[PDB]
Design an enzyme around this catalytic site. Structure first.
Site, PDB file in Angstrom:
ATOM      1  N   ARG A  96       8.278  26.007 -35.302  1.00  0.00           N
ATOM      2  CA  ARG A  96       8.548  27.409 -35.593  1.00  0.00           C
ATOM      3  C   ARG A  96       9.876  27.571 -36.339  1.00  0.00           C
ATOM      4  NH1 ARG A  96       8.940  31.261 -31.357  1.00  0.00           N
ATOM      5  NH2 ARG A  96      11.156  31.797 -31.150  1.00  0.00           N
ATOM      6  N   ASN A  97      10.754  26.536 -36.297  1.00  0.00           N
ATOM      7  CA  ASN A  97      12.065  26.599 -36.951  1.00  0.00           C
ATOM      8  C   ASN A  97      12.101  25.881 -38.307  1.00  0.00           C
ATOM      9  OD1 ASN A  97      13.217  28.310 -35.032  1.00  0.00           O
ATOM     10  ND2 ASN A  97      13.653  26.609 -33.676  1.00  0.00           N
TER      11      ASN A  97
ATOM     12  N   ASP B 147      16.698  27.504 -39.149  1.00  0.00           N
ATOM     13  CA  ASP B 147      17.295  27.958 -37.881  1.00  0.00           C
ATOM     14  C   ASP B 147      18.623  27.250 -37.489  1.00  0.00           C
ATOM     15  OD1 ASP B 147      16.477  30.127 -35.849  1.00  0.00           O
ATOM     16  OD2 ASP B 147      17.024  28.443 -34.526  1.00  0.00           O
TER      17      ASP B 147
ATOM     18  N   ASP C 223      18.142  23.034 -32.133  1.00  0.00           N
ATOM     19  CA  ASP C 223      16.913  23.811 -31.918  1.00  0.00           C
ATOM     20  C   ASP C 223      15.759  23.382 -32.857  1.00  0.00           C
ATOM     21  OD1 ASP C 223      15.136  25.778 -30.855  1.00  0.00           O
ATOM     22  OD2 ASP C 223      16.200  27.502 -31.763  1.00  0.00           O
TER      23      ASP C 223
ATOM     24  N   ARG D 262       6.048  41.289 -41.536  1.00  0.00           N
ATOM     25  CA  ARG D 262       5.746  42.411 -40.637  1.00  0.00           C
ATOM     26  C   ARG D 262       6.291  42.236 -39.181  1.00  0.00           C
ATOM     27  NH1 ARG D 262       0.443  40.461 -43.460  1.00  0.00           N
ATOM     28  NH2 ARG D 262      -0.312  42.624 -43.443  1.00  0.00           N
TER      29      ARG D 262
ATOM     30  N   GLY E 250      11.892  39.712 -37.372  1.00  0.00           N
ATOM     31  CA  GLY E 250      12.785  40.838 -37.131  1.00  0.00           C
ATOM     32  C   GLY E 250      13.180  41.549 -38.409  1.00  0.00           C
TER      33      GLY E 250
END
Ligand SMILES: c1ccc(Cc2c[nH]c3ncccc23)cc1
Ligand SMILES: [Cl-]
Length: 261
Positions: free
Chosen positions: A133-134, A147, A129, A25, A29
């Site tokens: 979160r990656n 990522d 990176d 959701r 993206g």
């Protein structure tokens, strides 16, 4: 080149993209649900994203490891086809109040990341990176380092109107990234895992981080983090890049700590 890329290219007759539905959701993206058919006719649930790309595709296609997110292929805006990750990103999962992973589970996630990073380093690949979160989780809670390559910028959202706190001191000063700077970011990721996704240095500005690290100040040991694991994190944040452990040394050290639980 159009020849050398064939084994990366997915024919329109092998992929059904569901352009009417996104995954997570909006969190990632415009990533769509997709159905990929393999040679034996098996249906593979996938994530499809719209984006010299053909080259990053060739290289990424040959990167295979259970702890690295694989590239299923590309469809010729061109499309990037990736495996569906049932439990989304690692930061989101560890932060979710509903979930209660043990100290062992959290260490296990860090070990899988180290394994994924050990593999990328052996292929001389520099991530740049690395952060919680990656990293993704699949149905069996297997951690996948994401990522990178064609799967980069997962969180770039379109509008109508540098991850400096994970970066090594030399990267902050020269804008140069190496495997040794990814080792620094891995240290920060272990700190995030042990704090269940808390933000690093919350009271320090992104501009004040260089001066803060040059003073020899470092992230403090989390409440439920074992002492040998914290010793490993401090080794990752050594100011001399050559003094930092390698990813293989990280896997060895972390797997032995994991086995004590
Ligand atoms: C670009 C955009 C998004 C991703 C993340 C991703 C890959 N597969 C997934 N399956 C479910 C949920 C999220 C994902 C990677 C690159
Ligand atoms: Cl979930």
């Amino acid at each position: 080149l159009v020849q050398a890329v064939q084994h990366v290219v997915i024919g329109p007759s092998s992929l059904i993209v569901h352009f009417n539905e996104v995954i997570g959701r909006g969190h990632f993206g415009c990533v769509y649900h997709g159905t990929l058919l393999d040679n034996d006719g098996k249906k593979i649930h996938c994530a499809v994203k719209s984006l010299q790309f053909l080259t990053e595709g060739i290289i990424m296609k040959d990167f295979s490891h259970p702890n690295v997110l694989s590239l299923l292929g590309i469809c010729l805006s061109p499309l990037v086809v990736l495996p569906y990750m049932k439990h989304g990103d690692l930061r989101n999962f560890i932060r979710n109040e509903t979930h209660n992973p043990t100290v062992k589970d959290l260490i296990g996630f860090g070990l899988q990341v180290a394994k994924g990073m050990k593999y990328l380093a052996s292929k001389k690949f520099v991530h740049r990176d690395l952060a919680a979160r990656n990293c993704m989780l699949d149905e069996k809670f297997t951690v996948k380092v994401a990522d990178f390559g064609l799967a980069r910028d997962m969180y770039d959202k379109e509008y109508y109107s540098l991850p400096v706190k994970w970066m090594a001191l030399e990267s902050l000063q020269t804008q140069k990234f190496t495997t040794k700077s990814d080792v620094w970011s891995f240290g920060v990721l272990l700190w995030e895992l042990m704090t269940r996704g808390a933000p690093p240095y919350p009271d320090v500005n992104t501009f004040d981080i260089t001066v803060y690290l040059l003073q020899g100040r470092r992230l403090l040991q989390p409440e439920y983090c074992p002492d040998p694991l914290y010793e490993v994190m401090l080794k990752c944040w050594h100011p001399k890049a050559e003094m930092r452990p390698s990813f293989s040394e990280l896997v060895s050290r972390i797997s032995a700590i994991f086995s004590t639980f």
